[PDB]
Amino acid sequence: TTIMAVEFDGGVVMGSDSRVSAGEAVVNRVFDKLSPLHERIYCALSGSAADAQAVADMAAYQLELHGIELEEPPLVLAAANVVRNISYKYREDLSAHLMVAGWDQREGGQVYGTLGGMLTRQPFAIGGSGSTFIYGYVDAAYKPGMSPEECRRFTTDAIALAMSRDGSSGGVIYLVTITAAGVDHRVILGNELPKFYDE
Amino acid sequence: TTIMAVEFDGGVVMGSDSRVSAGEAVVNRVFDKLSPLHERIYCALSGSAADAQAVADMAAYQLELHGIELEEPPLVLAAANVVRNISYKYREDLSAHLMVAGWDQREGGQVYGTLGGMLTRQPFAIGGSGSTFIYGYVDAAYKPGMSPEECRRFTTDAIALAMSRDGSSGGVIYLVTITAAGVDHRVILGNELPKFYDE
Amino acid sequence: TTIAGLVFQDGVILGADTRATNDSVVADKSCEKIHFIAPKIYCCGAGVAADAEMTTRMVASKMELHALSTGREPRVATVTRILRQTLFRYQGHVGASLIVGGVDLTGPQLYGVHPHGSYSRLPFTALGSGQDAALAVLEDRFQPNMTLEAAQGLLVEAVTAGILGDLGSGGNVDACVITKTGAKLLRTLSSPTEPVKRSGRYHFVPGTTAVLTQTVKPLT
Amino acid sequence: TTTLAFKFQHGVIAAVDSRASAGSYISALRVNKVIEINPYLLGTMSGCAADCQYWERLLAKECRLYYLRNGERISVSAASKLLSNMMCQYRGMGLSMGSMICGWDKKGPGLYYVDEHGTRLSGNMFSTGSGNTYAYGVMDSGYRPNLSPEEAYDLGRRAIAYATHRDSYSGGVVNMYHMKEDGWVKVESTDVSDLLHQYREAN
Amino acid sequence: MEYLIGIQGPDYVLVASDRVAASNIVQMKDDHDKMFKMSEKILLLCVGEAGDTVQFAEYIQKNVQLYKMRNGYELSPTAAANFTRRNLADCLRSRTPYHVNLLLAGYDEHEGPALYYMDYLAALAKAPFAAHGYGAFLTLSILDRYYTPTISRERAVELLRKCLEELQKRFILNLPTFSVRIIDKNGIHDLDNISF
Amino acid sequence: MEYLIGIQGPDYVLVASDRVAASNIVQMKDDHDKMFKMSEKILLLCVGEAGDTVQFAEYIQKNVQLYKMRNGYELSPTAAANFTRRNLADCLRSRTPYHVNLLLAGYDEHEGPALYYMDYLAALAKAPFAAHGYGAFLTLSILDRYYTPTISRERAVELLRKCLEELQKRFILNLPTFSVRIIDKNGIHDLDNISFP
Amino acid sequence: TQNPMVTGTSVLGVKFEGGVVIAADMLGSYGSLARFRNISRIMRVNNSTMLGASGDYADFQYLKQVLGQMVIDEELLGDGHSYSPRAIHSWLTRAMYSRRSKMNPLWNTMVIGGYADGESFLGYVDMLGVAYEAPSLATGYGAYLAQPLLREVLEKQPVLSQTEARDLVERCMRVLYYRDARSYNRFQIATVTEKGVEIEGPLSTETNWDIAHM
Amino acid sequence: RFSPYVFNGGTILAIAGEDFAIVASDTRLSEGFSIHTRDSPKCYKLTDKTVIGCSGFHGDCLTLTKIIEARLKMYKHSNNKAMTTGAIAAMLSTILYSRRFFPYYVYNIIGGLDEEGKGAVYSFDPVGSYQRDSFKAGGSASAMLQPLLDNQVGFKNMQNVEHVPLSLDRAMRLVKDVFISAAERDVYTGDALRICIVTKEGIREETVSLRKD
Amino acid sequence: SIMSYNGGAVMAMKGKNCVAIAADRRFGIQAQMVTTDFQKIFPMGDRLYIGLAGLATDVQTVAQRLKFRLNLYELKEGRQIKPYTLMSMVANLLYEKRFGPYYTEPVIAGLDPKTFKPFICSLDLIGCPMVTDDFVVSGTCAEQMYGMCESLWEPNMDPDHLFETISQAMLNAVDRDAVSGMGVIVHIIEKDKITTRTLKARMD
Numbered sequence A, B: 001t002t003i004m005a006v007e008f009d010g011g012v013v014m015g016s017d018s019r020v021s022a023g024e025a026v027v028n029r030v031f032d033k034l035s036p037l038h039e040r041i042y043c044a045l046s047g048s049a050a051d052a053q054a055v056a057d058m059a060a061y062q063l064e065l066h067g068i069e070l071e072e073p074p075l076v077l078a079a080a081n082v083v084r085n086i087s088y089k090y091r092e093d094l095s096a097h098l099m100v101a102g103w104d105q106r107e108g109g110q111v112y113g114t115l116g117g118m119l120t121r122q123p124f125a126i127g128g129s130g131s132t133f134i135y136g137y138v139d140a141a142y143k144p145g146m147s148p149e150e151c152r153r154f155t156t157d158a159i160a161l162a163m164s165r166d167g168s169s170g171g172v173i174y175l176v177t178i179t180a181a182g183v184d185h186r187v188i189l190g191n192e193l194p195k196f197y198d199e
Numbered sequence C: 001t002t003i004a005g006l007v008f009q010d011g012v013i014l015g016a017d018t019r020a021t022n023d024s025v026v027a028d029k030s031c032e033k034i035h036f037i038a039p040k041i042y043c044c045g046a047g048v049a050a051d052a053e054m055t056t057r058m059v060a061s062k063m064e065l066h067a068l069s070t071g072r073e074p075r076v077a078t079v080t081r082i083l084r085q086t087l088f089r090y091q092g093h094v095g096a097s098l099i100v101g102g103v104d105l106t107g108p109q110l111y112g113v114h115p116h117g118s119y120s121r122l123p124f125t126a127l128g129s130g131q132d133a134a135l136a137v138l139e140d141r142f143q144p145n146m147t148l149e150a151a152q153g154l155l156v157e158a159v160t161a162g163i164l165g166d167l168g169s170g171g172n173v174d175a176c177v178i179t180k181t182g183a184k185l186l187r188t189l190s191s192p193t194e195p196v197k198r199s200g201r202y203h204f205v206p207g208t209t210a211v212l213t214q215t216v217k218p219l220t
Numbered sequence D: 001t002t003t004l005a006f007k008f009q010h011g012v013i014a015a016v017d018s019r020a021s022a023g024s025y026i027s028a029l030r031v032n033k034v035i036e037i038n039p040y041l042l043g044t045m046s047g048c049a050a051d052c053q054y055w056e057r058l059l060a061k062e063c064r065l066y067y068l069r070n071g072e073r074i075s076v077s078a079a080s081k082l083l084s085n086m087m088c089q090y091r092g093m094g095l096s097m098g099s100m101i102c103g104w105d106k107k108g109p110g111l112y113y114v115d116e117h118g119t120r121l122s123g124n125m126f127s128t129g130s131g132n133t134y135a136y137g138v139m140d141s142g143y144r145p146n147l148s149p150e151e152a153y154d155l156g157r158r159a160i161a162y163a164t165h166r167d168s169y170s171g172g173v174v175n176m177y178h179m180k181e182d183g184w185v186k187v188e189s190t191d192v193s194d195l196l197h198q199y200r201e202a203n
Numbered sequence E: 001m002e003y004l005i006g007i008q009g010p011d012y013v014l015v016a017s018d019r020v021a022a023s024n025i026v027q028m029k030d031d032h033d034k035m036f037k038m039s040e041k042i043l044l045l046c047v048g049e050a051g052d053t054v055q056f057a058e059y060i061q062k063n064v065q066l067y068k069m070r071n072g073y074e075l076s077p078t079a080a081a082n083f084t085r086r087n088l089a090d091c092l093r094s095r096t097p098y099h100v101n102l103l104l105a106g107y108d109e110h111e112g113p114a115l116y117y118m119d120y121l122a123a124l125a126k127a128p129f130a131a132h133g134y135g136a137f138l139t140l141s142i143l144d145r146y147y148t149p150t151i152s153r154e155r156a157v158e159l160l161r162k163c164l165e166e167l168q169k170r171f172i173l174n175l176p177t178f179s180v181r182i183i184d185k186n187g188i189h190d191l192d193n194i195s196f
Numbered sequence F: 001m002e003y004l005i006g007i008q009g010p011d012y013v014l015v016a017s018d019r020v021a022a023s024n025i026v027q028m029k030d031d032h033d034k035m036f037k038m039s040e041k042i043l044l045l046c047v048g049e050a051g052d053t054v055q056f057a058e059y060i061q062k063n064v065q066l067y068k069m070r071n072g073y074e075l076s077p078t079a080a081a082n083f084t085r086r087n088l089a090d091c092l093r094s095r096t097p098y099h100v101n102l103l104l105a106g107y108d109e110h111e112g113p114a115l116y117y118m119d120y121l122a123a124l125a126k127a128p129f130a131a132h133g134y135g136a137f138l139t140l141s142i143l144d145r146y147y148t149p150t151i152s153r154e155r156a157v158e159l160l161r162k163c164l165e166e167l168q169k170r171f172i173l174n175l176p177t178f179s180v181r182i183i184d185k186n187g188i189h190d191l192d193n194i195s196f197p
Numbered sequence G: 001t002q003n004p005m006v007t008g009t010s011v012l013g014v015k016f017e018g019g020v021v022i023a024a025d026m027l028g029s030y031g032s033l034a035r036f037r038n039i040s041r042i043m044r045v046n047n048s049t050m051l052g053a054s055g056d057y058a059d060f061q062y063l064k065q066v067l068g069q070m071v072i073d074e075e076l077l078g079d080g081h082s083y084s085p086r087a088i089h090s091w092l093t094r095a096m097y098s099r100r101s102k103m104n105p106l107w108n109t110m111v112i113g114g115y116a117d118g119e120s121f122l123g124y125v126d127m128l129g130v131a132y133e134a135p136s137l138a139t140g141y142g143a144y145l146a147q148p149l150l151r152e153v154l155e156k157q158p159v160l161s162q163t164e165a166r167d168l169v170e171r172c173m174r175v176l177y178y179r180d181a182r183s184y185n186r187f188q189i190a191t192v193t194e195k196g197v198e199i200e201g202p203l204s205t206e207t208n209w210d211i212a213h214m
Numbered sequence H: 001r002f003s004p005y006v007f008n009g010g011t012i013l014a015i016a017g018e019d020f021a022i023v024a025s026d027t028r029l030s031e032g033f034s035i036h037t038r039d040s041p042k043c044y045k046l047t048d049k050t051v052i053g054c055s056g057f058h059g060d061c062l063t064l065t066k067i068i069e070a071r072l073k074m075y076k077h078s079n080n081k082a083m084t085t086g087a088i089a090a091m092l093s094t095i096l097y098s099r100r101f102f103p104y105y106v107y108n109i110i111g112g113l114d115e116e117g118k119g120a121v122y123s124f125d126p127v128g129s130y131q132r133d134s135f136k137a138g139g140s141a142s143a144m145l146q147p148l149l150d151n152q153v154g155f156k157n158m159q160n161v162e163h164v165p166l167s168l169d170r171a172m173r174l175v176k177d178v179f180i181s182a183a184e185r186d187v188y189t190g191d192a193l194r195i196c197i198v199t200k201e202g203i204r205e206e207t208v209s210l211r212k213d
Numbered sequence I: 001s002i003m004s005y006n007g008g009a010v011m012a013m014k015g016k017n018c019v020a021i022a023a024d025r026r027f028g029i030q031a032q033m034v035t036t037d038f039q040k041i042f043p044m045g046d047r048l049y050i051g052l053a054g055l056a057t058d059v060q061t062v063a064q065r066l067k068f069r070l071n072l073y074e075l076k077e078g079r080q081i082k083p084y085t086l087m088s089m090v091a092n093l094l095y096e097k098r099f100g101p102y103y104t105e106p107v108i109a110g111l112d113p114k115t116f117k118p119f120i121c122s123l124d125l126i127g128c129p130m131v132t133d134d135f136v137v138s139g140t141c142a143e144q145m146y147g148m149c150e151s152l153w154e155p156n157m158d159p160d161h162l163f164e165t166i167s168q169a170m171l172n173a174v175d176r177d178a179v180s181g182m183g184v185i186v187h188i189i190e191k192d193k194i195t196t197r198t199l200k201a202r203m204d
């Protein structure tokens, strides 16, 4: 898997590949790893499929009731703490990383890391097996003040670059743009991926 | 370690970081991993320090006598086969990767990979623990027809990008430009390294 | 062990402690870790004491045969290569970690040789269980082209930091200065611990020990 | 350790070694390996030192509590059975304790061997510890039920003495008790090398 | 390591057991009884691991005694064998399994003589004759050879002596003396110990 | 598992060994001899692993016999014990180490009676009395108690009887018969077997 | 936590005349990978105490949460009593030992610096409940590289000024960056004096690589 | 796999005299080949007539020490009197055996006065077995100092020797000389010797120096 | 441990113009004592002795393989070996088995043959020579021996003082070791004579 989130002025862009594997076998080649936790709050799934889906199901439930009690959309910090606490309490039994990003009236567009029960805000963040091969790329390619389109292009290029190199990553790139107005869903097909040196 | 070689019209550019570690301990922080095998042939060392130095010592010896018998500078293919054969015969006991690059009257500037006794010619090649984090970068940044200076910046940028991310890589960058005219040796200090996003 | 090397304006300084430990017990309070290889080549040994002793003895003996045949002063590159090729052959089972320092026709040189047979040419180095305490002092205060006494002082401080900070190191600081004109073996150059004094009243009056048998063999 | 106990015409003789070791190191040259539970009830100790001390002190507390409840002393059979039930509750826990519950009650002299497994044997002769085999050899050879109190003190003295000679985990002093009808009497606390030297000097 | 034997006749059950209480290489006791009277006409012979045996046998004994007190009559050898089995089998998958191998001999007024064999796993088998321990490997074939269902007690005692004599000739373990007992219509009768 | 015993007097060496040849839980033989005559005045009593014992003892025997034939005189108990020691110790760090435990008894015209103890590691000890096997744990203390250096052969047989009786009373292994032999100025003398019926 | 994930390297500490200074790089490593090069590993506990932490970052963040709340809890009372640096060190020892005894340690080695009633405080607590006070501390690999330099200076001059202590810490961070293969050239210097806790960052030590030309 | 123990070294020693008891220790605390601190004395004052020496795993030393401290207060509140040296020893055995299956890796040596005002020493193993002693050594250099205590303080192996009982002055000189020998040969013992003296008058502390390496 | 299978202890000590060497006399397998008169000190010259602790088979083997080389050496050289040279002979003998060693830790005690100036040393199981100017220990009770020697040893001890010191340091050390004992033997090596004494020691 290769997951990625990028903050911009009015919100966030989140991306993921589409490969679900079981050893060297592709089980699902078109999985959408960008799972909604609330209207305007999403998480990118990685690691154990069963663990990631379980944590997402519980976080969306906790956040739904939290939102209805505060008579307000939950804060992205609250959604990040929700996921983080589950990942931390069960870190010995869970083997999943759920990146949390979205939008708020208070702090606007924010990107969070939940790796092993930790919590960290990032201008952009990457995860999954595929992220290992694009650290140098994202370090060279990231520039602050990127537009939502520039964020989608940074996310698409970085994920395609990882998809080529990583056996556990491939398929299609799913893009999601969370903003005050709402959420936009894009899909970049395996035919339409950006091309780079592949020999 | 992060090693790298790039072919160009009149020859090759080879680079390496300078870290020599023993666990989490830096043993020598300014070691030159670009070892000459002949006048216009060099190899970039990675993996076990004892194994890499042993193979280089033997390859330079075998190539010196080979060159004197043919009354000619050895071909870079001959030097690549020399290193490859040692790495292959002793692959169960050796844990080093020696990239081989240089120049010839015949085939000109060539870059070879020797990983585990295999042999492959590459337009450019990377190695060592640090290479893992710059695959996506070199895949995006490499363009054919690069000048020797463009090869040197490409090699400098890719090695600095890996040095920052890799704990087993660091120090200065040693650059070497092998051409018909001769060999040029450069050292990019830890103070003069190119800067990218490092947070 | 805390063994250390330095390259100054007119040569090389080699430092060593005097502790030999046998599993948390100090066996020797003053052993010699700086060994002769050739008149202007010395070597510090750290690790398995028999392995450091014998690999240093063998290369010194090989360098005597080298110099006798060539008729020239030995080169420090030769001792480095003879040592590496021997250690590599033994796959790290010969546990000698060495600091080779010396002066030949090409100037002063300092090398670190590890048990598996890897080496590096360094301006300063430290090996042994206390190498990090010495390497901190060297990194903190090394400047190139130092004077004889500035280097001697820095080296003493580097070995002393290891003597005090490493449980596997102690005793005195032994040192060796090597210059174009030869080597000065400064044994017990520094003693970070002043002579330990007790009020020892452990005299036994003759006869206290009960003897069962006594045979006396006169000699000549 | 080397503990021994034997019934005879004049009661029950109980003798113990005094060595405690940690690997090959001697942690204690002299340790008391006999718990005096009451004037008529003793316990010998071998195995893990902490297990011996705590468990036998727990039997003693229960014996004392029995006397307060009934106004009578506990029998040798109930005290030995009590200890083996404690051991049984901690089966598989890694306890190490070998003891002989020696005493005198309404049914005459009593000697029981109790083990960490919950073994409970009544008998007229036992030996426990790393040197028990050496003690059994000397004891068996000179034992006759009609032994004088002084002749039995020599049999118990020599049995431990010879076992400390061959067993590296036995030494120090012999602590010997004689269990009579009106309670026990601590016979002696004698240095084993002095005894062995006395026997060597007699050759 | 220990030895148990049973031979059932037309109207009696003959049983024998070694008398050694051993620990390590030493024979601590030569006069150790391994049979536990459960009822007036029931004996439970029990062999096995160090503590487990007395602990298990006595728990069954006390519960068979509690049945007698509670109801005024005793358990039958069948009910007493099945009750022994229920407890052993219930501890099998528990934290504390008992490593006990036992034999239950008994005489019922309605069903006659019965001899039961129980594994340490708590498999229950009714057998005309049985043996437990390494000694069973040397004696089950002697019993196979000479046992007949009409065997008189005097003849069974002779057959038992041949099995015990076989353990002296070929068994590496020193089993010198044995307890011998017969259960019949009049109860448990102690016979002379078979000694060597 | 097996039993060896030796008691050396002022002018003789008394030795005894169990007679059991056993496989698994069965006593295959009741009349098994464990002593090997090396010379006219030397016996090598040998116990240990399944094959190792006969193989090792017979190799030494034939080499001691080759010495007699080669030189016209026999090895002394000391030279024969040190030769046994050299071979056992030489196989120790080899592919084929021998798991044998032994006692060498003998009588020298110049040095007198000698009894040697050797474990499978090949440590050689000269002792006034010795024992090998689990039985040694029950009998070394009986020998410590009653052994004196002036012990007559008749008395040493009563001492050996006390040790063998101890194995019947306390040893868990059935060892009912034992080979008994005395080595003196006139060579190896077979004594009556100590039996327990 | 039986197996740490993102870990921090050495945490340095040295008391001076009028307070204590603590230092730590801003790196979280996943093995050899410098995964987070800008995370703070230092925390202001309250007005008199500050804590730096080596080892697992998720466990440090958890302790930062638990401590942070304890301070808030105390401050609601407003009774003129507050946790001394020494009391935070005592609590933290009991906290680590308690988790260690349940065979579920918090994978950290921490340094607590403080200044209460004119007295400087410097205490060490590890994942097993081993605690002690010292004039200078260095966790992890720093116990081999930096502690000899701190002790070397404190041997010559036992009482250091705030400036001397600060320059000594900058010299130690430069050595650690050269020698520790799990360090980064980005760090924080936190100082506790009469005025209270002051965390400074991000800092970097100038590097010299002239030895490359030798 | 995580190990809940670490060896932090250090040597403790106690001597029971006619009217006094000495409990002494080095001040070194270490781990591996590192020194944590040079000022870590292993002597803990429990009552005005009872001192304890603790050595082994420092985490367990700190804990068992706070538990002993808390239990004495509990006893004082319950019985309206201070625990005697014998009651502290008997109690410590039960506390140590309460961790029979997860021991306190601590070597304890209690030293103080008995109810007759004489010297009392009680020595323990990590799991709770104890006895009263004339003297005893514990900790890293335990095996170096114990044979000399057996000889010089117990008069062992000495025939035709006048058995003069030890005085406070003579025992203090012996503690100072044995810790100097322990510091010369044991890597875990050094920096300083902390001595606690218990008499009718109370507790005094003396601190002599040992090798820094 | 392999070295603790047999047990035992050996010690050597320097004096004025004399030298001492001592050892226990136990020979035992694990916790069972076999003999009480096992030889662990072997003469190598008039004034030169070697003491070997550790595995009894290798104590005997090393002493015998060393005597073989020594005898040949003295026959080819026409001189008695110098104490330092005997140390180098043992170091080379032991180091030959570096990767499969003899389980023995020797101790050498002798007087120089011209100066009669004492010499003491010890070698680890792989032949690492170590000369000291005070004492050397080797055994299962090395920790006990170091404690006794460090406390009891004094510089210029007369032969009588040296005897009391080495005797008391061996007796009290070995008396705290379960697998060492059964008597102690001491040799006092002077220019004029050798004095051998067996001490009256504990037998447990």
Ligand SMILES: *[B]([O])([O])[C]([C]C1=[C][C]=[C]C([C][C])=[C]1)[N]C(=O)[C]([C]C1=[C][C]=[C][C]=[C]1)[N]C(=O)C1=N[C]=[C]N=[C]1
Binding pocket: A001, A002, A019, A020, A021, A022, A027, A031, A033, A045, A046, A047, A048, A049, A050, A052, A053, A128, A129, A168, A169
């Ligand atoms: B990815 O490679 O990490 C992917 C992410 C993921 C998360 C939530 C839900 C899904 C699909 C239901 C996928 N996870 C996987 O592909 C993993 C295997 C994996 C994990 C880490 C690195 C590489 C590969 N898939 C499973 O665990 C799984 N899927 C199908 C059947 N069994 C297990």
Ligand SMILES: *[B]([O])([O])[C]([C]C1=[C][C]=[C]C([C][C])=[C]1)[N]C(=O)[C]([C]C1=[C][C]=[C][C]=[C]1)[N]C(=O)C1=N[C]=[C]N=[C]1
Binding pocket: B001, B002, B019, B020, B021, B022, B027, B031, B033, B045, B046, B047, B048, B049, B050, B052, B053, B128, B129, B168, B169, C114, C118, C119, C120
């Ligand atoms: B590199 O990190 O792989 C580096 C390259 C190298 C090649 C030849 C010679 C040297 C210096 C003498 C270095 N190799 C090392 O740093 C290795 C350890 C290593 C290997 C693989 C990944 C990361 C690190 N160095 C050693 O093996 C070593 N160095 C000194 C002492 N002992 C061992």
Ligand SMILES: *[B]([O])([O])[C]([C]C1=[C][C]=[C]C([C][C])=[C]1)[N]C(=O)[C]([C]C1=[C][C]=[C][C]=[C]1)[N]C(=O)C1=N[C]=[C]N=[C]1
Binding pocket: C001, C002, C019, C020, C021, C022, C027, C028, C031, C032, C033, C045, C046, C047, C048, C049, C050, C052, C053, C128, C129, C168, C169, I123, I124, I128, I130
């Ligand atoms: B040093 O403390 O690492 C030391 C080096 C040494 C010792 C004596 C003499 C020389 C010169 C030939 C060098 N090493 C030892 O003390 C070693 C054990 C060791 C190994 C690795 C790390 C720490 C310690 N000790 C011995 O080899 C030894 N000790 C006693 C007697 N003989 C040998």
Ligand SMILES: *[B]([O])([O])[C]([C]C1=[C][C]=[C]C([C][C])=[C]1)[N]C(=O)[C]([C]C1=[C][C]=[C][C]=[C]1)[N]C(=O)C1=N[C]=[C]N=[C]1
Binding pocket: D001, D002, D019, D020, D021, D022, D027, D031, D032, D033, D045, D046, D047, D048, D049, D050, D052, D053, D129, D130, D169, D170, H125, H126, H129
């Ligand atoms: B004995 O050897 O079985 C002995 C028994 C013993 C020791 C001390 C105190 C008592 C009763 C108060 C009994 N046990 C030991 O010596 C054991 C080691 C042992 C165990 C089994 C067989 C042989 C030896 N030693 C300890 O338990 C121990 N040693 C040091 C410190 N604490 C405990």
Ligand code: NA
Binding pocket: D163, D164, D165, D166, D167, D168, D169, D170, D171, I203, I204
């Ligand atoms: Na003994």
Ligand code: NA
Binding pocket: C162, C163, C164, C165, C166, C167, C168, C169, C170, H212, H213
């Ligand atoms: Na030190």
